């Protein structure tokens, strides 16, 4: 599991990204015109936690 | 003494055959009556 | 500086004592230019005109005018010491719109210049290297796809390569108390099946051929071999010849998996009439038969009788070591364990070359010391088959673009007369031949089939492995606790 | 056995999200708290979706 | 070449191409040994009877 | 237990089928560029 901390290099081909930041981005902004604001609550669960 | 011919005779020699079986994972009243 | 075209140099350091040690990657950019023109040899008979592609210039000459350059820009000799680490021809445009490529290429320079490190001072250093002993606790697995129609896989700069079979290892996890499933790719590879002629004699008052201990049909005269194009990481972050090793035992334990290599041409055949049809192989057996067959409404079996009345029951295992490219590099070390001996003087016993020395070591290394012990210190290990094979691409009739590795035995077999076969054959095959004789040959008769309309890229060389060699290496990595698991 | 992505939701996993459902209103005095559906998203999200 | 595209003039119409005929000038390095053509001029044409 | 027959069964034994060879006298740039 831990074998990339092992055997490491400077610069990786595979970085990943935020799918979650991505949509939850998205959601707020199409609701932040309306008048539904705080009608809604948002919670991120992710496997580091 | 007497006696080209096409094709490549050490080719045949170099095939692998088989390996061994080793580097696989292995899976997971009457007589005694009296 | 005297050099044929413009190149860039990347560089990095690192520190020993007090000393420096400089490493670099060279990328000369060639997308541009007028190609090269053919050069006139000698021949037994007379004169031919040989083709040559980007990498014939590089000699050294262009090696000393590098290092040069390198020296002028660290400072001068007293500020360190400087060594090449890799060379790769970059045949494509670079634009103001080229960012992927960029980075791509900044990380295979920054792989090969660590390694190289690694390579030179670890020891020093305090830096360790892949072995089997890191994949104790879990469990490998392999998976293997045939596909033939369609795009084909590609190399760093986004040229074609032919994959018509594709293994994968990886790793299987579970956790402990949630019970889930996930699984860690790690390295691929990618191949195809030729064939070579090799008839039996047996007028020769010689004994029968035996294969595995038994005897064969009298009809039996080709012989299958697979050729090793490509093979690279997934989701390592490194690439070593360790990492190399690994994926060949991987691959080799796969296709010898209930003999799951014979269906690439199963597969093939269910396509009917084209260039890859076996059923080629009917006017083999039988000489009034002037028509391919087709086999595309038999059942496996079928085909499976049909085809082991021409072939041999067995597979070679060869492979293409380019002569520049992004892992050319760490692949030079097949060609120099070749040599066996250095012809030195010996007090006793003969001294043995370093490039035999580093081969074994690794091998020895990866399986933690078993090796060693099963195989003899001094046998062979690789041959050279002598033959210089071209690289490039060409327009396929599906819109794309398809590696120029597509002609072979079969698409001649498939779609020329039998005097090219024989043509094509000969030079793959007669030992009185030099090597450019048969690269004259070899180009003349791809440029009639495709009528000129192909490019060239570069240059490979064909080895093949000892059988007792690999059998020996199974053997050692499944007596230091290593056992895989293929899926598919 | 072949397996898909929903086979990895048990019961396990339902209990992580309620706790993280609790903790984002605030505790179990603050009210309560039920699971109303599910869907999995196969496809990538960007900045342009 | 006589299947797809064609050869085209300055303002971009298709000229018949049947033929392409290149001279060029080649190159040799005295010392450093290096290969290069420098290419002239091209005519087109086709056959009629 | 039940069960002549022409030809010499002794003489395909003592046939010499081939000898030793040495009976016979004998007959008489990229990778290393860095």
Same mark, same amino acid.
């Given at each position: ?49 | ?34 | ?40 040899? +000698? ?117 074609? $390569? ?21 699984? +860690? ?30 005897? $064969? ?219 450019? +004789? ?32 690999? +059998? ?17």
């Amino acid at each position: 599991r831990t074998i990339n901390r092992t055997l490491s290099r400077r610069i990786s081909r595979n970085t990943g990204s935020e799918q979650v930041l991505n949509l939850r981005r998205l959601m707020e902004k199409y609701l932040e015109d309306t008048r539904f604001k705080d009608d809604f609550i948002f919670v991120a669960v992710d496997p580091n936690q | 003494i007497q006696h080209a011919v096409r094709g490549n005779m050490a080719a045949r020699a170099r095939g692998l055959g088989n390996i061994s079986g080793n580097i696989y994972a292995r899976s997971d009243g009457a007589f005694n009556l009296f | 500086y005297s050099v044929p075209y413009p190149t860039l140099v990347v560089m990095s350091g690192a520190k020993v004592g007090d000393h420096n040690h400089f490493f670099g990657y060279v990328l000369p950019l060639v997308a541009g230019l007028a190609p090269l023109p053919r050069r006139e040899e +000698q021949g037994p008979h007379g004169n031919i005109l040989v083709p040559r592609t980007w990498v014939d210039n590089l000699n050294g000459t262009f090696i000393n005018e590098v290092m040069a350059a390198m020296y002028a820009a660290i400072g001068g000799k007293s500020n360190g010491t400087a060594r090449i680490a890799g060379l790769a021809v970059v045949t494509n445009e670079i634009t103001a719109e080229s960012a992927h490529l960029a980075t791509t290429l900044l990380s295979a320079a920054d792989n090969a210049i660590q390694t190289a490190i690694e390579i030179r001072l670890g020891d020093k250093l305090g830096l360790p290297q892949f072995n089997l002993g890191m994949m104790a606790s879990d469990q490998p697995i392999s998976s293997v796809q045939y596909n033939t129609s369609g795009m084909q896989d590609s190399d760093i700069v986004g040229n074609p $390569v032919r994959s018509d079979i594709t293994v994968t290892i990886s790793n299987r996890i579970r956790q402990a108390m949630s019970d889930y499933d996930s699984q +860690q790719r790690l390295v691929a590879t990618t191949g195809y099946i030729d064939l070579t002629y090799s008839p039996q004699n047996p007028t020769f008052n010689q004994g029968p051929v035996l294969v595995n201990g038994y005897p $064969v049909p009298p009809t039996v005269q080709y012989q299958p071999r697979y050729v090793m194009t490509s093979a690279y990481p997934l989701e390592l972050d490194a690439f070593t010849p360790n990492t190399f090793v690994l994926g060949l035992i991987g691959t080799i334990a796969t296709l010898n998996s209930g003999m799951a290599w014979a269906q690439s041409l199963i597969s093939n055949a269910a396509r009917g009439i084209g260039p890859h049809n076996p059923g080629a192989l009917a006017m083999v057996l039988d000489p009034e038969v002037t028509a391919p067959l087709d086999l595309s409404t038999q059942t496996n079996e079928q085909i499976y009788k049909f085809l082991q009345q021409v072939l041999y029951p067995s597979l070679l295992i060869s492979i293409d070591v380019p002569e520049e490219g992004e892992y050319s590099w760490l692949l030079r070390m097949i060609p120099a364990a070749e040599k066996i001996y250095t012809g030195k003087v010996e007090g006793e016993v003969r001294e043995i070359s370093e490039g035999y020395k580093a081969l074994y070591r690794a091998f020895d290394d990866v399986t933690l010391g078993c090796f060693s012990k099963k195989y003899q210190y001094g046998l062979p290990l690789v041959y050279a088959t002598g033959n210089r094979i071209p690289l490039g691409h060409y327009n396929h009739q599906d819109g794309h673009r398809h590696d120029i590795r597509d002609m072979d035995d079969l698409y001649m077999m498939n779609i020329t007369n039998p005097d090219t076969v024989e043509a094509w054959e000969d030079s793959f095959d007669r030992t009185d031949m030099t090597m450019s +004789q048969r690269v004259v040959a070899r180009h003349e008769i791809i440029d009639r089939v495709l009528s000129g309309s192909w490019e060239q890229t570069g240059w490979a060389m064909r080895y093949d492995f000892d059988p007792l060699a690999l +059998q020996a290496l199974i053997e050692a990595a499944a007596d230091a606790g290593f056992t895989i698991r293929p899926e598919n």
